[PDB]
Short mmCIF file of N, CA and C and ligand atoms in Angstrom, two decimals:
data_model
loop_
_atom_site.label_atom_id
_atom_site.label_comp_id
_atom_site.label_asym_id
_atom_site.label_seq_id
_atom_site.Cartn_x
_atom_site.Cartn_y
_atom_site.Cartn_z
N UNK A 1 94.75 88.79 124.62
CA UNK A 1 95.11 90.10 125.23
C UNK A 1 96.58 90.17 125.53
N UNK A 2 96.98 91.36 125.94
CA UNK A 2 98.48 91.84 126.02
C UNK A 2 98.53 92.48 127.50
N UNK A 3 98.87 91.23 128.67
CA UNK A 3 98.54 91.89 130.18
C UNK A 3 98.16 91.18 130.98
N UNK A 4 95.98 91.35 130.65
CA UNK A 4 95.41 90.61 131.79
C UNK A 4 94.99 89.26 130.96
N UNK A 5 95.28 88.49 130.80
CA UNK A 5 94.31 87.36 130.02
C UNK A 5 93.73 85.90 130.50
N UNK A 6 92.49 86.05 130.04
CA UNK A 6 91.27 86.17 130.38
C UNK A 6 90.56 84.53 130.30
N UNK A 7 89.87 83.76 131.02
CA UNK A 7 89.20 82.77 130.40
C UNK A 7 88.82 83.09 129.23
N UNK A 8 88.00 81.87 128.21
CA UNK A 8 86.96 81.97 126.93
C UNK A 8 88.58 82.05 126.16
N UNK A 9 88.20 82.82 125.26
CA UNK A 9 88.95 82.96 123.64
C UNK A 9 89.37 84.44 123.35
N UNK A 10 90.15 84.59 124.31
CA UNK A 10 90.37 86.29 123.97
C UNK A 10 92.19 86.24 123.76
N UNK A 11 92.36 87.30 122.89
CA UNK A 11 93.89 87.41 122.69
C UNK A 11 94.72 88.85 123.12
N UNK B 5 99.66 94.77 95.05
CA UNK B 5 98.98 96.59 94.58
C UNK B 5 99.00 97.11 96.65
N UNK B 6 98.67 95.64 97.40
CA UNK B 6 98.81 96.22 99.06
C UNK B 6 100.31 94.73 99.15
N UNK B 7 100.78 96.00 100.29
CA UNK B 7 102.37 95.30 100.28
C UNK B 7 102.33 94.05 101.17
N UNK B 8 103.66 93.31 101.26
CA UNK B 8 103.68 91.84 101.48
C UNK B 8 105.13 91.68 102.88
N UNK B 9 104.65 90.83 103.58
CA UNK B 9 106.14 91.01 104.71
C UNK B 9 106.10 89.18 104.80
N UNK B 10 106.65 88.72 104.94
CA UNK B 10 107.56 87.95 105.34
C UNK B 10 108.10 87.19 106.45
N UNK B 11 107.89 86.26 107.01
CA UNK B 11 108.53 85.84 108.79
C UNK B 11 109.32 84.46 108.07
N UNK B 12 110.49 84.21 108.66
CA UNK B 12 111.17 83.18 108.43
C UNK B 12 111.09 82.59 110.13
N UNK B 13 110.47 81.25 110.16
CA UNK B 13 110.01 80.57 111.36
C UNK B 13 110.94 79.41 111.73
N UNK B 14 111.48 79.62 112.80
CA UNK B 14 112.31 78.69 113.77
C UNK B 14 111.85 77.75 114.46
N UNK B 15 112.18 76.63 115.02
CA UNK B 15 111.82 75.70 116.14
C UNK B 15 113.11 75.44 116.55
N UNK B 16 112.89 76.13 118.16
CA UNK B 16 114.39 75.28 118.77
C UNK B 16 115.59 75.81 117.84
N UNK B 17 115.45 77.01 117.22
CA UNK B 17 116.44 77.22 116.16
C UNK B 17 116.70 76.82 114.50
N UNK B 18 115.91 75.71 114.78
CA UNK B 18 115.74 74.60 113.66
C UNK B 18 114.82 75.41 112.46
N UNK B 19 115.17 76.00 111.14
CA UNK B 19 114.52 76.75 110.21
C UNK B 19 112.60 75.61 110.20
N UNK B 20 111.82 75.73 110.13
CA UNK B 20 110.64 75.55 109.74
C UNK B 20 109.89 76.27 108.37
N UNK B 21 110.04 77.10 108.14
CA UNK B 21 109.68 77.85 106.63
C UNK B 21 109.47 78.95 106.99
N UNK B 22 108.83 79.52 105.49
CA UNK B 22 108.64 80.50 105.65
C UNK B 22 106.61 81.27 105.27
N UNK B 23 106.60 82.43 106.34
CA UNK B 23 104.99 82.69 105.98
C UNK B 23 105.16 83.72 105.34
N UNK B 24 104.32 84.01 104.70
CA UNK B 24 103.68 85.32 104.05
C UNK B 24 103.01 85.96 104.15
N UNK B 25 102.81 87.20 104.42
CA UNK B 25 101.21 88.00 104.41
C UNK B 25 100.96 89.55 103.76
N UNK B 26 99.79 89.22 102.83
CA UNK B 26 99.26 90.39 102.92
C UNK B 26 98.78 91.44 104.02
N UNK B 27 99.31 92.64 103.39
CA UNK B 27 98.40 93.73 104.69
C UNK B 27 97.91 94.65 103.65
N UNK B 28 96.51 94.51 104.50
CA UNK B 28 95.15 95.88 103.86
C UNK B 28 95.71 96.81 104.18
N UNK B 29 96.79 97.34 103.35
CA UNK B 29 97.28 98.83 103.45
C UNK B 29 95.94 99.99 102.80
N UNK B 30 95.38 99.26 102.08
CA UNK B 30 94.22 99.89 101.22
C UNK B 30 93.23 99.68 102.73
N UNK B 31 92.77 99.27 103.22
CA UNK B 31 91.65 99.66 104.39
C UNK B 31 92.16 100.11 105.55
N UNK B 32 93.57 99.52 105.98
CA UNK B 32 93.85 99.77 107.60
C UNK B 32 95.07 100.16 107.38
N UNK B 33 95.52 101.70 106.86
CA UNK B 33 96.87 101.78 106.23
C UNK B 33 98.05 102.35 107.82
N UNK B 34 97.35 102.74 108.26
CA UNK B 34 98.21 103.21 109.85
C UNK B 34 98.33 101.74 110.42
N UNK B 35 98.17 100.81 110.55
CA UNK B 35 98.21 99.50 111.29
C UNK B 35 98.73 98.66 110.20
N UNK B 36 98.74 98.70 109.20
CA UNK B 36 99.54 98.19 108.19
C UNK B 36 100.86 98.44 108.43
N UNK B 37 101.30 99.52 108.15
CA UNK B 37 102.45 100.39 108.26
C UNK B 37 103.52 100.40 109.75
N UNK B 38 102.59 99.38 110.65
CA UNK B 38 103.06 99.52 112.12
C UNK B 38 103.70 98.38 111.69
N UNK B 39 103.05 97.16 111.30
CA UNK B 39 103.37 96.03 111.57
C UNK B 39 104.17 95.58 109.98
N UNK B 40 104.25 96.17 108.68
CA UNK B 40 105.86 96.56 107.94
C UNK B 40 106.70 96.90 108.53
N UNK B 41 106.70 97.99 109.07
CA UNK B 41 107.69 98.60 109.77
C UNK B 41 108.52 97.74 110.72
N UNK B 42 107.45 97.53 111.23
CA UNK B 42 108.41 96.75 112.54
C UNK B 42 108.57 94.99 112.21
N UNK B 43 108.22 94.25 111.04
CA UNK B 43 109.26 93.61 109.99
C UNK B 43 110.04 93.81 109.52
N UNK B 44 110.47 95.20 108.93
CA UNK B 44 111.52 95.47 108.28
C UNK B 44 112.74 95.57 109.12
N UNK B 45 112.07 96.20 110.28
CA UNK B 45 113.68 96.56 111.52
C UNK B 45 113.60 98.37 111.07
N UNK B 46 112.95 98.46 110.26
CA UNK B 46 113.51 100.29 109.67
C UNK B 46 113.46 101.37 110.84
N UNK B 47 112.82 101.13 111.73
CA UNK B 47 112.62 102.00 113.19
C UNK B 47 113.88 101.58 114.49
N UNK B 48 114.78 100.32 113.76
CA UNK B 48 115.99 100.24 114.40
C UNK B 48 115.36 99.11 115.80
N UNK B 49 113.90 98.60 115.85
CA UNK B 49 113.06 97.47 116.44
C UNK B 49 112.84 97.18 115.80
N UNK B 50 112.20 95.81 116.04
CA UNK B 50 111.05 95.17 115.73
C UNK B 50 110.88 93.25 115.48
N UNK B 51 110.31 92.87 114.73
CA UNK B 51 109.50 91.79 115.21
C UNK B 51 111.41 90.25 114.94
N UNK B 52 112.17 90.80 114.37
CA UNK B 52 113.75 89.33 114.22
C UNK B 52 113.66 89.46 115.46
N UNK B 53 113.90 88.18 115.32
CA UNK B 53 114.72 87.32 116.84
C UNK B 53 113.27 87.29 117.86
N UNK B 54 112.50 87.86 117.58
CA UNK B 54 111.28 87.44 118.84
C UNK B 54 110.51 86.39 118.82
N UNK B 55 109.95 85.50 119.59
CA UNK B 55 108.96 84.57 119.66
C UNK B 55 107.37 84.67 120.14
N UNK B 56 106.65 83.29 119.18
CA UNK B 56 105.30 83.35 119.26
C UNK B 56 105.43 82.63 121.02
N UNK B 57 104.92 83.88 122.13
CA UNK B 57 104.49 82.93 122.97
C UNK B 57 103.59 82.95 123.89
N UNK B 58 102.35 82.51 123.20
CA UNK B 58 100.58 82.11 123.26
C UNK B 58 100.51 81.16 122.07
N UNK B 59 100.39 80.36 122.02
CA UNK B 59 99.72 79.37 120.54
C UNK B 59 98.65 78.32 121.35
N UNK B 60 97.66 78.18 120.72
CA UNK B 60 96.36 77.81 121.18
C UNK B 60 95.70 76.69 120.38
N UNK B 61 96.33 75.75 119.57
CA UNK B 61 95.93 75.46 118.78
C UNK B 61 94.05 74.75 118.60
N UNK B 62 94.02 74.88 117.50
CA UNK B 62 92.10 75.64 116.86
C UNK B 62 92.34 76.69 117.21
N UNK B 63 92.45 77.73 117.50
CA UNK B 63 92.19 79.28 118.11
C UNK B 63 93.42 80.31 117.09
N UNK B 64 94.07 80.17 117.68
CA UNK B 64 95.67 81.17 116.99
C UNK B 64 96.68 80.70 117.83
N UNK B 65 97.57 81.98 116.74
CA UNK B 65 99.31 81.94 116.92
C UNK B 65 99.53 83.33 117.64
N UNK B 66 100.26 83.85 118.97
CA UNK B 66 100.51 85.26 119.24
C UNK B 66 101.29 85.32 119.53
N UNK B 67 102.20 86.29 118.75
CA UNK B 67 103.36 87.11 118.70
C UNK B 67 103.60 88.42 118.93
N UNK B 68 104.88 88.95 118.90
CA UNK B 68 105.03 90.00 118.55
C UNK B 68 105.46 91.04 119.95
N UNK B 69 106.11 90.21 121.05
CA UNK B 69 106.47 91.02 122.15
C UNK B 69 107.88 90.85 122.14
N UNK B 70 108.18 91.95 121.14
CA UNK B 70 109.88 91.50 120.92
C UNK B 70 110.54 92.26 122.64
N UNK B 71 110.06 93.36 123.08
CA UNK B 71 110.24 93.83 124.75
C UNK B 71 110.30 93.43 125.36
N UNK B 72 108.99 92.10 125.95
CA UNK B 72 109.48 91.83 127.10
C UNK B 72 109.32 89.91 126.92
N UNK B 73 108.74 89.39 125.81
CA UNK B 73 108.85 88.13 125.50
C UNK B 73 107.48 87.16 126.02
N UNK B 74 107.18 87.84 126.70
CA UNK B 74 105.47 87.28 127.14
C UNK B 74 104.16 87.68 127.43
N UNK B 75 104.27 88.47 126.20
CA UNK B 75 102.78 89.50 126.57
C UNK B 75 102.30 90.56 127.05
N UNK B 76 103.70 90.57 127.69
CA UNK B 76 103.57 92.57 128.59
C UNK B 76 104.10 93.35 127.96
N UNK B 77 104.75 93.13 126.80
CA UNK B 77 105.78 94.33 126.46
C UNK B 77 105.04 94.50 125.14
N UNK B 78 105.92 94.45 123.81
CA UNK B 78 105.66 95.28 122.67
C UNK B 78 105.50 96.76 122.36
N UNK B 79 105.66 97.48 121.54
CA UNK B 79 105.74 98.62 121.01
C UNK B 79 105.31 98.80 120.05
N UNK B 80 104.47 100.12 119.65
CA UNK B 80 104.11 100.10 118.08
C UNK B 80 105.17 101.32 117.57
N UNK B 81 105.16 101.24 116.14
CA UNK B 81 106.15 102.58 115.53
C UNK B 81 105.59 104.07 116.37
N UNK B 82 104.39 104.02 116.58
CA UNK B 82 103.81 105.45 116.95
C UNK B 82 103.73 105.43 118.52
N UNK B 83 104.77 104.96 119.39
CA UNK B 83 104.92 105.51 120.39
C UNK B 83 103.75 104.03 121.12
N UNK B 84 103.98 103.59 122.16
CA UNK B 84 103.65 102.55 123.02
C UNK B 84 102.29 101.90 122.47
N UNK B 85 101.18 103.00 123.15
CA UNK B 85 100.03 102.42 121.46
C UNK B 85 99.49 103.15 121.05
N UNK B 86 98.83 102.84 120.13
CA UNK B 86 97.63 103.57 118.87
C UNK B 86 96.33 102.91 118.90
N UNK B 87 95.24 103.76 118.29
CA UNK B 87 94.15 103.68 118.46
C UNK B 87 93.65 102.31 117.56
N UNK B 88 92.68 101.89 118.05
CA UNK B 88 92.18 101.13 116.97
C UNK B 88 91.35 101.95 115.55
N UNK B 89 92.11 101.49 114.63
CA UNK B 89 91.75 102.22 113.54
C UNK B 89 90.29 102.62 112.98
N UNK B 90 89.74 101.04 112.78
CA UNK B 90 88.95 101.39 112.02
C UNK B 90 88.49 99.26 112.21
N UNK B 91 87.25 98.85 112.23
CA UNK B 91 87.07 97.22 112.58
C UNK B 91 86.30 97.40 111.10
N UNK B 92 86.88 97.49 109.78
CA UNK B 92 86.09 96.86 109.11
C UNK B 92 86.07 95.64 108.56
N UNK B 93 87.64 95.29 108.15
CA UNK B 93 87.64 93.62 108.70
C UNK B 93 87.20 92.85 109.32
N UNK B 94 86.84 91.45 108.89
CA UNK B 94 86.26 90.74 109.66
C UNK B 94 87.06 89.45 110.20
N UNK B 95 86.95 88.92 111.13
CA UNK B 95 87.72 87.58 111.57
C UNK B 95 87.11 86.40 110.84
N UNK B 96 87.19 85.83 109.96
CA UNK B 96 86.49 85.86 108.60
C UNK B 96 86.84 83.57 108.57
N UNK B 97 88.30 83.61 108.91
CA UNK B 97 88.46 82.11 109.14
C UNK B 97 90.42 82.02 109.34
N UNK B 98 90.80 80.74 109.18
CA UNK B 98 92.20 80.84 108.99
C UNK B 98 93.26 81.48 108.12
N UNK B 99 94.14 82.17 108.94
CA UNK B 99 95.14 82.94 108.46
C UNK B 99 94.71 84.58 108.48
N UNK B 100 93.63 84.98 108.75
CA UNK B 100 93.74 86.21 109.32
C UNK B 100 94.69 86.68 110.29
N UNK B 101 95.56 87.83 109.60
CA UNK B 101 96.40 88.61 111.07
C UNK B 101 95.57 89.58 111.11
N UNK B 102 95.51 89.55 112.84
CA UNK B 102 94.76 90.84 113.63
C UNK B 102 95.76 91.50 114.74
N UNK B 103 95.12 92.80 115.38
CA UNK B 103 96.32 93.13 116.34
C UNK B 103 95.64 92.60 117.89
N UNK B 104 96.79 91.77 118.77
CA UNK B 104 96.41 91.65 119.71
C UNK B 104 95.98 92.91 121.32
N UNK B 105 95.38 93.18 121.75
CA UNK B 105 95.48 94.14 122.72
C UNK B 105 94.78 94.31 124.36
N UNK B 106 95.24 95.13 125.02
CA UNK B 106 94.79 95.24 126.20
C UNK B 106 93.52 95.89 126.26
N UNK B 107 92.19 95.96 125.75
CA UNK B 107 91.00 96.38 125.34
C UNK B 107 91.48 97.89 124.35
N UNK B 108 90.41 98.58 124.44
CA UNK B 108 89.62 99.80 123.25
C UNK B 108 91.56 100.66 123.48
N UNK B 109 91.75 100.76 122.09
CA UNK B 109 92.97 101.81 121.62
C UNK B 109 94.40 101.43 122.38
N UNK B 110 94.78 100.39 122.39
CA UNK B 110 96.20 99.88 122.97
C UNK B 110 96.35 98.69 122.24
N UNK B 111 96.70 99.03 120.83
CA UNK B 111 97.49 98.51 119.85
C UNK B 111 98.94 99.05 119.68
N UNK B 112 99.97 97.77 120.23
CA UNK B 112 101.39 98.22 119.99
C UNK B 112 101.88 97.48 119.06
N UNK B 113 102.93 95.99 119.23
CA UNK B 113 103.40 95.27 118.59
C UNK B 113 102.59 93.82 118.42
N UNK B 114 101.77 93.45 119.23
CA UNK B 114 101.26 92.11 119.50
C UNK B 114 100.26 91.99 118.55
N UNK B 115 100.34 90.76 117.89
CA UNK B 115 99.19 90.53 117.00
C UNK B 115 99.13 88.96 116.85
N UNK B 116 98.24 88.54 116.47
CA UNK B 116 97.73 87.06 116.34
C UNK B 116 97.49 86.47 114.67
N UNK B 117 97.72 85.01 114.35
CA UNK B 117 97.19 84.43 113.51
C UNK B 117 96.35 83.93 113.58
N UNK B 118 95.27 83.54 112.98
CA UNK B 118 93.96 82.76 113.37
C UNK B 118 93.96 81.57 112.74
N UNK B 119 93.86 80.66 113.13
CA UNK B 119 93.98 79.07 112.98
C UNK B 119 92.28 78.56 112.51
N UNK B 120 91.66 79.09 112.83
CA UNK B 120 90.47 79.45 112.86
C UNK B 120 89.33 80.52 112.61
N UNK B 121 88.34 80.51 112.11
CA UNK B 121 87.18 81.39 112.46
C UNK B 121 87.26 82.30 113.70
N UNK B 122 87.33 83.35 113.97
CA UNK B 122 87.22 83.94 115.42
C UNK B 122 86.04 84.71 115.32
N UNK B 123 84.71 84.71 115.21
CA UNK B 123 84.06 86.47 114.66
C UNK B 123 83.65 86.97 116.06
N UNK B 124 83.79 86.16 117.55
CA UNK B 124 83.66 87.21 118.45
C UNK B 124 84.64 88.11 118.95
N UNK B 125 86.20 88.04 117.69
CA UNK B 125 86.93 88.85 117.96
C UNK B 125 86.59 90.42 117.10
N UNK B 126 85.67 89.99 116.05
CA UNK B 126 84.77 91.23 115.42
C UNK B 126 84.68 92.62 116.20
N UNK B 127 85.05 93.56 115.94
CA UNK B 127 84.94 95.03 116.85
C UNK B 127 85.66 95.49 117.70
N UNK B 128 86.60 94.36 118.53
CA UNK B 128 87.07 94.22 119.07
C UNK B 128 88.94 94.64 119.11
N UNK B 129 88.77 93.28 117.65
CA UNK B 129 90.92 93.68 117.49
C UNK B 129 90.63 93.83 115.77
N UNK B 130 91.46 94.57 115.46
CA UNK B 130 91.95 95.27 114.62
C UNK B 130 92.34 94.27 113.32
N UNK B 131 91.92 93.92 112.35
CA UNK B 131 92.36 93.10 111.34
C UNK B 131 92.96 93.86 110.54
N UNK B 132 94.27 92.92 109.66
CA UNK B 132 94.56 93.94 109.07
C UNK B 132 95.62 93.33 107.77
N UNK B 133 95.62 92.15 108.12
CA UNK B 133 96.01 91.32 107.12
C UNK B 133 96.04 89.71 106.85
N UNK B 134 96.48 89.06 106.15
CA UNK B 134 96.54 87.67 105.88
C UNK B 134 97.25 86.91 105.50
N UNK B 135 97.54 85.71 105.87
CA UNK B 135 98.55 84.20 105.20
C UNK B 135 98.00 84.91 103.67
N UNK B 136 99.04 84.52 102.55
CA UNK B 136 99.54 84.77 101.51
C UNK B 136 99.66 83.21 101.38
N UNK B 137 101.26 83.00 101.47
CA UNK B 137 101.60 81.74 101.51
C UNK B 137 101.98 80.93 102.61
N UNK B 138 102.29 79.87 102.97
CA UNK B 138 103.16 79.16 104.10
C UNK B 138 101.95 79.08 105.40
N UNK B 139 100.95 79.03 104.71
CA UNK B 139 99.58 78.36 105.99
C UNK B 139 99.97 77.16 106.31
N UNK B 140 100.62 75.79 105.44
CA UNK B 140 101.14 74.74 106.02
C UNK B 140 102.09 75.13 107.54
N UNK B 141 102.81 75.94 107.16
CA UNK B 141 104.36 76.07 108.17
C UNK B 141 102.87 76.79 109.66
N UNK B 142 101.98 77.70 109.33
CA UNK B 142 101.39 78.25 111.01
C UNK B 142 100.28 77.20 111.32
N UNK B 143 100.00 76.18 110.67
CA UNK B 143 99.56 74.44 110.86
C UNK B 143 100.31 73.85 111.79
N UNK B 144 101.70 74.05 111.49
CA UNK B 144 103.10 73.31 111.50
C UNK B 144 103.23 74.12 113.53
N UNK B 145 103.15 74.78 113.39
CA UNK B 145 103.69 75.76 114.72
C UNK B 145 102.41 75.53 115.67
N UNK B 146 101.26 75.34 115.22
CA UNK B 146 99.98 74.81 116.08
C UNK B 146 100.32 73.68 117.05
N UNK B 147 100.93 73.06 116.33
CA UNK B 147 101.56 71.77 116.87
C UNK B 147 102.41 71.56 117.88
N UNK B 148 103.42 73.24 118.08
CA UNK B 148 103.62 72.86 119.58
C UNK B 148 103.31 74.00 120.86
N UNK B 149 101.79 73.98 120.25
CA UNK B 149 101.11 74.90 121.46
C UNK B 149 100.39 74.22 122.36
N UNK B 150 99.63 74.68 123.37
CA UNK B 150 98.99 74.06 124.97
C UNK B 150 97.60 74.88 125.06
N UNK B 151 96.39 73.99 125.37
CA UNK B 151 95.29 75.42 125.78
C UNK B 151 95.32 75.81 126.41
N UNK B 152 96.21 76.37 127.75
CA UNK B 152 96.85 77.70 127.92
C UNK B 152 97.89 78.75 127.04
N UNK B 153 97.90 78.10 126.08
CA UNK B 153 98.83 78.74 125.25
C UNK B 153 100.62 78.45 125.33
N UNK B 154 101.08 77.93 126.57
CA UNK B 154 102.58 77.78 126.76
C UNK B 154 102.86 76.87 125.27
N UNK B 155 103.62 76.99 125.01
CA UNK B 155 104.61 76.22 123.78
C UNK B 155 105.12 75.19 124.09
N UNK B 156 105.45 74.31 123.59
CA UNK B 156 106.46 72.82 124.18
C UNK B 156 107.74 72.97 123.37
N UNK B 157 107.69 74.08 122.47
CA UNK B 157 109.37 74.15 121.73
C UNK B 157 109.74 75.53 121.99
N UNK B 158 111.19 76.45 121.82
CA UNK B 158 110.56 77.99 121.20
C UNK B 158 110.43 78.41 120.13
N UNK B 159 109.46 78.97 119.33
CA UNK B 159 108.77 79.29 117.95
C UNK B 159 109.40 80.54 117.92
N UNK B 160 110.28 80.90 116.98
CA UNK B 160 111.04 82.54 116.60
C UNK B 160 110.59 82.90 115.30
N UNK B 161 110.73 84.02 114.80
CA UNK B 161 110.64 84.55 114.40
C UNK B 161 112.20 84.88 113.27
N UNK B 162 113.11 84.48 113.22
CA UNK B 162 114.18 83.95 112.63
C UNK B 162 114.80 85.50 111.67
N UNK B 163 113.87 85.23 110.98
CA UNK B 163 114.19 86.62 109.96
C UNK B 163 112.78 86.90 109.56
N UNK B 164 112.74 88.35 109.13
CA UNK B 164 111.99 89.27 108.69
C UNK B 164 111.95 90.14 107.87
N UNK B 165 111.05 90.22 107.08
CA UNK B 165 110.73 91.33 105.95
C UNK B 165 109.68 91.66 105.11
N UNK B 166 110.36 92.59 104.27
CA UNK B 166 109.57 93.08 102.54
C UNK B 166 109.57 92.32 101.68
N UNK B 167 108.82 91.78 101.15
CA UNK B 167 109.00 90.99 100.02
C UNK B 167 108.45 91.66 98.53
N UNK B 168 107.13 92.38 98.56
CA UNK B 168 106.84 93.97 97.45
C UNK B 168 105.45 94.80 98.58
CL1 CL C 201 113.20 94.20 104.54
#
């Protein structure tokens, strides 16, 4: 992600 | 027959090679066209001189916040962001580029390489192209990422472009 990012596998 | 861009990759300044990628201008031609564009520099931005900084290695490479340099910033050609196009791409294995984002329709500049398989990124982010050549060299850049993603070198982006 672009911001909040997140546990796990996120972009 | 779908066009080709180019990243010339730095360490610490130090040239590392160069990648290649196709973009599905033929399936995802508005998100294609964001992320040419803003390789080429033709919008007077875009992706020279910025760094990858998220690398995850097994997971991906993320780039593309030439604004603010860590994930908050980026821009797309069409004004801050754009919708997600269209998920018919799939996160399929290594060397998929997808666009990175802040959930549903806030696609700007940020996008990821996949080092890996991702398919619960399926529906989600926006695929839209692929390593061509120089999968050794985003192997090569895995190498100095953290599973938080911080870097242990800085990874640039050096030069950029069209190649057809
Ligand atoms: Cl160019």
């Amino acid at each position: 992600t672009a911001x909040x990012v997140l546990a796990x596998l996120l972009v | 027959v779908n066009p080709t861009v180019f990243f010339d990759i730095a360490v610490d300044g130090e040239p590392l090679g160069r990648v290649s990628f196709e973009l599905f201008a033929d399936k995802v031609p508005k998100t294609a066209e964001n992320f040419r564009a803003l390789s080429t520099g033709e919008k007077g931005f875009g992706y020279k001189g910025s760094c990858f900084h998220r690398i995850i290695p097994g997971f991906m490479c993320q780039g593309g916040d030439f604004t603010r340099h860590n994930g908050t910033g980026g821009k797309s050609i069409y004004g801050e962001k754009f919708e997600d196009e269209n998920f018919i791409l799939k996160h399929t294995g290594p060397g998929i580029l997808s666009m990175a984002n802040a959930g549903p329709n806030t696609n700007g500049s940020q996008f990821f390489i996949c080092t890996a398989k991702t398919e619960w990124l399926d529906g989600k982010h926006v695929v839209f192209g692929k390593v061509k050549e120089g999968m050794n060299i985003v192997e090569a850049m895995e190498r100095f990422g953290s599973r938080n993603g911080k870097t242990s070198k800085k990874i640039t982006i050096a030069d950029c472009g069209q190649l057809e």
